[PDB]
Symmetry: C4
């Protein structure tokens, strides 16, 4: 039966049928948003949902026999596995993000339609070039986050109280989001010199970020 299924799975109709399902479960998920819609068609949607989930595991099962090892060395395939697997944990127990993480299957429209794959791959491929910088920065954030925690977290614990909090705040300053009126001006009412910590921080982090982008507009 091997070549029978290898001709079912690999068939245009099979793929195009999967894609047709994604776009339907996709649409169906944007409807599960309406409290109104659930009070009229809630049952329709939960069933339709459970259905598609089977169809996708059947498919993923079929897909595996036709590929075996070759499959668990395909990024795109692994993805579909894990995404469907997430969708498999029952509508219960554990955390509830799993019920929410289900909507990740709409990312299959990327995986199971070229052009997306291409563009996605075009994007991801840039990442290796950045890891030298990214590393540098994370060391930097780690260093400043520590300094910040022990300079400001006594009077300003919301913002710098914990190593993690400083990380968050520092990230915020880096996105330049409300950094002066929101954060540094307050700090200064107590620690006049706080500007000496944040202006340099901003220069460095924005400098690095400009290089990093110019780096990507060459490779």
């Amino acid at each position: 039966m091997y070549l029978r299924i290898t001709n079912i799975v690999e068939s245009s109709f099979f793929t195009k049928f999967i894609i047709y399902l994604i776009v339907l479960n996709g649409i169906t998920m944007g409807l599960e948003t309406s409290k109104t819609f659930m009070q009229s068609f809630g049952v329709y949607t939960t069933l339709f949902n459970q259905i598609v989930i089977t169809i996708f595991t059947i498919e993923i099962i079929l897909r595996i026999y036709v590929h075996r090892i070759s499959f668990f060395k395909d990024p795109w395939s692994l993805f579909d596995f894990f995404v469907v697997a997430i969708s498999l944990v029952p509508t219960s127990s554990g955390f509830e993000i799993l019920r929410v993480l289900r909507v990740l299957r709409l990312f299959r429209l990327v995986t199971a339609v070229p052009q997306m794959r291409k563009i996605v791959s075009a994007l991801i491929s840039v990442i290796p070039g950045m890891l030298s910088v990214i590393a540098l920065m994370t060391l930097f954030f780690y260093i400043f986050a520590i300094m910040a925690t022990q300079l400001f977290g006594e009077r300003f614990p919301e913002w710098f109280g914990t190593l993690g909090e400083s990380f968050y705040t520092l990230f915020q300053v880096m996105t330049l989001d409300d950094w002066s009126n929101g954060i540094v001006r307050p700090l200064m009412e107590v620690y006049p010199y706080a500007w000496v910590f944040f202006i340099p921080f901003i220069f460095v982090v924005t400098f690095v970020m400009i290089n990093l982008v110019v780096a990507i507009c060459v490779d």
Copy 2:
């Protein structure tokens, strides 16, 4: 009579006369802004305004006898038709926005003068080389918007209570506009881990946007 009017329409004087009317009507519309000016010279204005609208329909009528089907295959011509069209719907009934949409005719200055046409066309021309990415993002926004609506819309309905609102709020975070003190910090007072949703959201969306820009610094 055709070649008579073809010579009239194609005549530089005709074009330049149109362009002259635009720069007059534009100035007129900026004066229609002043409550003072309208009490003084509102009469002068509304008639000069209606006059121009006639002239522009006559022109557009003339312009079609001289181009026929070639016209409705011209972007710029279509534009002008559709723009003057808007301005034709009476100063009453339906949606008061129409009366306001009238000012779109000042975009005829773009259409009736080249170099503008050049620059605009230069701009537009970049779009198709972006649609692979734009689509990618929209799928992303769509996925996260749904996730957010079901993660935060109960305690935070202004911001996430609805698919639309999540779209809006998500866009706002993307523009990095007041995203931390304005939104995530609040969110966190209830959902400590909301940073796990938004920091990734921010990296991705910002990354994509950098690639999209560099993509245009190649083509």
Copy 3:
């Protein structure tokens, strides 16, 4: 005496004596900032000021005989002229920005030193290859600023009440400064669809602004 002075003006000493004065008057102007310093050495620096103002007029006079018509066709010279002229208008009368515009002379350090001149000129020269774009944008701002005034000015006059106000607010949205929580969200409490005006406005304006930057990276 012509060639005598033509040898004084062109003299490296003279030029370097000018640059020396600038850096002093510059230093002197940052000292004039302190209320304390003025209560000690105010009279010192006021005279020192009037002194330098003469020296600079003497020079610009000498500079003219030596160059005549050639001088009033030099950007950098015209500048130096006008910036000294401002510094000549009596310490009284009219507007008091003239007392404040006097600090523009420190821009002579840009004029009187190359590399600065190089860099300034390098910058400026990019401008003509932007005017096509700048025009487009200004037309756009003018169009939207009009729409906005007659759509939100009635309920929201601080922000859109006047053509100028809308220009201002629009600029602010363009810099993406506090635009959603600060403006569009309030707007929406009254005009639910105001998002329809501002999201597009942002796309256009930021798209256009990105192209304009990529233009300056191929020129």
Copy 4:
């Protein structure tokens, strides 16, 4: 004994031992953040600290014999000296920032690992080609910072009261951080024309900054 140690220092083991210490002290410094961890194992980590600081000075001592004048002409080497030196200054007296500045030693992970050194060097190397522009801006900031102090510092001393504050505030406008609702709109409630100072300021400073990035995508 010279060549004996020149084979100790210049050994793989040595370097990799140093790197191993950094990553350990680094982890130790993130644990010193927790008030909990300090009430438990504070003693462990305070000793561990003095230990590493010894090892590092011994190493730096060794490193100098093996290198002499070649060492105090290596950026990276000088760094480690200075950084370790700061870490030597007793746990008392003067200012406490010295105690905090100690965490700068984690920058040795950059000093003492290539690729980092490469990437950092890549970045720093870009700087000299910016000094022409940077200079320009600092003159510009200085000129406007002075202007602002005398136009707004009387009614608005938090923001422009002192030369320094104006620098700070102006910097903030440059990052476009809450500049309109936070600063200019208020300023305008008293000085209607303040927009005539800040909008130009913003174009110039943003324009320049755009070029400066385009420069770094050519050099």
